[PDB]
Write a protein that binds this ligand. Structure first.
Ligand code: ADP
Ligand code: BEF
Lengths: 49, 49
């Protein structure tokens, strides 16, 4: 094995931020989402298959 | 690590020269290993060198 990381070349590399952007679901996407949940429940969700 | 630096036109940094240092023990000892450096640190510079 031979492994190095960016901490040895640190203090010259810029910062790294991980943002999380939340976006609410659309109306037709909620109706189609609940429609696929109900129609999936007609097939018993295929969870244990 | 005692490298002959001819035909190496570009410039490499110190940790990549240490990559050639740890790469010098592979072909001279007839050993094969996996070089897994952090992405963005120039493994191709070590291979070309
Ligand atoms: N001595 C150096 N000076 C400036 N840039 C360098 C140097 N060594 C490597 N790089 C940059 O680092 C990058 C290394 O990419 P590459 O070796 O192809 O994949 P990775 O390093 O992600 O495995 C190159 O695009 C190059 O521009
Ligand atoms: F590891 Be480098 F991004 F090819």
């Amino acid at each position: 094995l031979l492994r190095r990381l960016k901490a040895d070349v640190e203090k010259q590399m810029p910062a790294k931020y991980e943002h999380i952007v939340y976006c609410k679901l659309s109306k037709r996407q909620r109706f189609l989402y609940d429609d696929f949940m109900s129609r999936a429940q007609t097939k018993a969700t295929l969870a244990s298959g | 690590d005692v490298p002959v630096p001819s035909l190496l036109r570009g410039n490499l940094r110190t940790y990549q020269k240490q990559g050639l240092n740890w790469l010098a023990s592979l072909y001279n000892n007839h050993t094969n290993g996996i070089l897994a450096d952090e992405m963005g640190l120039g493994k191709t510079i070590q291979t070309i060198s």
